[PDB]
Design a protein around this ligand. Sequence first.
Ligand code: HEM
Ligand code: HEM
Ligand SMILES: C[C@H](O)[C@H](O)[C@H]1CNc2nc(N)[nH]c(=O)c2N1
Ligand SMILES: C[C@H](O)[C@H](O)[C@H]1CNc2nc(N)[nH]c(=O)c2N1
Ligand SMILES: Cc1cc(N)nc(CCCN2CC(F)(F)C2)c1
Ligand SMILES: Cc1cc(N)nc(CCCN2CC(F)(F)C2)c1
Ligand SMILES: [Zn+2]
Lengths: 411, 411
Amino acid sequence: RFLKVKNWETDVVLTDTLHLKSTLETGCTEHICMGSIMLPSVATKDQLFPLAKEFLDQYYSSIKRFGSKAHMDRLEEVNKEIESTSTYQLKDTELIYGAKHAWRNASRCVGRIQWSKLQVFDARDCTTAHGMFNYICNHVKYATNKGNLRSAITIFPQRTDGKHDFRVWNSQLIRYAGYKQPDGSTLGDPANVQFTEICIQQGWKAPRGRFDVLPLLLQANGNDPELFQIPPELVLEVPIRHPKFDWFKDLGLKWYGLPAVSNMLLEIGGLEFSACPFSGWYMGTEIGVRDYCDNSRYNILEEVAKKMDLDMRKTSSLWKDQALVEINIAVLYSFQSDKVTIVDHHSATESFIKHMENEYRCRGGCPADWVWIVPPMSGSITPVFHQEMLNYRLTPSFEYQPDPWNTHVWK
Amino acid sequence: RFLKVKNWETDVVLTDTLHLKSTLETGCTEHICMGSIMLPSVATKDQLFPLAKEFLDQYYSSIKRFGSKAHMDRLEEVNKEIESTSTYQLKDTELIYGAKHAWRNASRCVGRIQWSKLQVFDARDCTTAHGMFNYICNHVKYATNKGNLRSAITIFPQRTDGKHDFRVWNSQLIRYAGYKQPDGSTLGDPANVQFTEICIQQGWKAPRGRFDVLPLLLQANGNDPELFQIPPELVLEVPIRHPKFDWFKDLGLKWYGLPAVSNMLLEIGGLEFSACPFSGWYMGTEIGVRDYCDNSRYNILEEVAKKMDLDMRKTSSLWKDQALVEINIAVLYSFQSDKVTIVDHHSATESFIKHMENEYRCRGGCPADWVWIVPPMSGSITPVFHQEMLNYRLTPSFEYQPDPWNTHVWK
Ligand code: HEM
Ligand code: HEM
Ligand SMILES: C[C@H](O)[C@H](O)[C@H]1CNc2nc(N)[nH]c(=O)c2N1
Ligand SMILES: C[C@H](O)[C@H](O)[C@H]1CNc2nc(N)[nH]c(=O)c2N1
Ligand SMILES: Cc1cc(N)nc(CCCN2CC(F)(F)C2)c1
Ligand SMILES: Cc1cc(N)nc(CCCN2CC(F)(F)C2)c1
Ligand SMILES: [Zn+2]
């Protein structure tokens, strides 16, 4: 009831009692562990008040005014509005608290040491896709800050009935296009090949190349989504060069500075925000390892090995490993030489251990998903490999949600 | 009740029903996942027959003689012996089946594609530590096979009362010594520093160097353990050289060929074999990544980076990553040039996916621990990173057990 997690590199032990507050289910049972399953899995007025109460109790118990008169009135105020409207609206302060704690509770995120430095943009007055585009453009501009990246989230109106949903259809605000070829292979990013074709379906004019920034597909109040192009001056890009290999420029790779997830659902006090694009800065491995070297992504281990003069005949020459380190030295070096914020997986994972210690002390725990926290290269030379982690589901939270083109009732 | 695991690199799906046969508990609950906890946690005659029955049912249902007369007599035969003796003895065939399936069920093992090619040595007639040494020496000789390594296990008498236990006190049959210094630092292997001092306590004469093979500490029928030196001609060693860097020989590293775990417990039909040393061959990363580059092991990233001419000032130069690839190219290259069996993490993890497909088809599943299957470097460029895995506990099994010096009643 007071579980211990050990670090086996430092012998440091920490005690978790935060997991007691946990509410949702993980997927695992007493007899099966599902910690390597990727995506394991309308609202009525009865369900809503315990969720509002639970949330309001921790918000006021965090501004040191637990259960006071100011609390109990807000508790009464929300109850009455859930009676009247069968839903309710968050105060601006409650929205900012909820958002920051959805990120704080995100067990799959290695960057949460920054969770309280989050800029919250309140777009709950938005009504059209054009307003969404406008809000999103101001988000991109603000978070990018000329390469001195700043963390941010923009929150569109909450789900009401279910058939009037705000959705950003892109999985990220800035992604490169993916075109399959007549000869079967793929130009650009294979991940987005279906999304690239949805944009052409609704009317996009593709400049069929490699790193073509996709347009936004924005759905407002359930209406069919509409295409908008981010002004290119707002899409900051880093050309990737190596600090040794001058042929590396000829590879002709580049990446966008701003990681901005737009397909997830923010849950606050039982309210569901179906469009809540949120952005930080990249850990280098996300680009250099997964984006560039995943077999079903850009898949560049082939060509980088070639130009490095590598023994590619044998599996056990580790040519794949060797070209992979060089690629991530190049991503890092390019971002820093351009004053574009980026963190290496050693600095990020050390910061997360430091974050874990802060959380266990002044919070009694830190939900953490080892499968996702450990970086996708050099796992055991980073301190998170050696750190036991309890995973559990706290609210407020970011949740996955179906792709909107499978669920929308089109017209 | 018929769960699906997906591979996200190939989109291949497999259905698990083997997990239904699972019996033991994992540590996880509906509300907490413990898949990154390292070690999560006398026998009476009532408990013993269901365990014997369960085991005998699957043994006969595997030689295509489920529930026949030959089965039901053995079922009756064991019941009567559990009445008579409050325990029982396995047939030689049952011992070999049980052992091979303990390995087959070992969810943390990436090498299980070889599980049916296991050589079982029956040491249940052993009575003294000298007999144990003799059995163990024949095990080392057989499994090493002049570098053409062969998988093997030696099974000493089963636990009876609890105070008459056979134990190998070494955690592995062949390990290097670890000496702390007066100036605090460590020569040899820091993992074994306490065990190195237990040997000196019982009378070992340490040649205080680096790669000093430790002696065996063998406990027989609960008696205090005794020291024995493996004849050095039976300890095959690989000197580690690089196929580019001739200064790499000057590093003066070497490793033993034979990975042989000796501190675990083999459970078969509810019988407990407290001494069951088992050996295979190395995956290169176990040496080059964990043994050599763990901070609290040999910790050689420091010196390899130096001689490579590396930017060691900054964290984000990835000097640690770069020296790590070279070290594992050297481990691999040395073992193969000496005709000593070794597998690279690309070949081993591809073989394990292939193994998983075989298991899901002709067995309905494969218990697998992602946290341990994914190699400790280059995780996502190997196919196991992208493969969902269900972890569950099947029997027969290898289980962890306390170190014998914490539990023994000495005299
Ligand atoms: C500030 C810099 C940040 C860094 C360095 C960082 C790092 C990461 C990384 C490496 C992942 C794994 C993503 C993947 O492998 O696909 C991740 C996941 C995640 N991050 Fe963070 N992150 C940052 C900011 C944020 C912010 C500002 C939020 C929310 C407001 C956030 C919420 C999440 C969530 C919900 C996930 C899970 C995504 C999923 O499950 O698909 N992160 N983060
Ligand atoms: C044949 C070549 C083999 C290879 C390449 C191999 C590979 C591995 C690796 C890399 C690990 C993780 C160990 C670690 O990181 O400390 C492991 C664990 C394990 N292996 Fe295998 N193995 C082999 C043979 C065997 C055999 C013959 C058995 C049993 C008869 C076995 C049973 C186990 C067990 C029980 C574990 C878990 C150890 C623990 O939890 O501490 N392995 N194996
Ligand atoms: C099968 C496995 O769950 C899947 O590949 C996960 C593994 N861990 C991950 N970790 C991170 N950070 N990102 C990912 O996409 C994944 N993918
Ligand atoms: C904290 C974590 O459970 C621990 O470091 C594990 C991680 N995965 C591992 N995987 C393997 N193969 N071997 C290990 O020793 C470990 N250690
Ligand atoms: C805010 C943020 C920062 C960062 N550094 N990284 C991410 C994750 C990028 C997208 N990930 C693919 C997925 F959908 F699984 C989530 C998000
Ligand atoms: C048979 C075998 C083969 C192999 N290739 N590797 C191992 C594991 C070596 C020891 N491991 C450290 C631990 F105790 F955790 C288990 C065992
Ligand atoms: Zn679990």
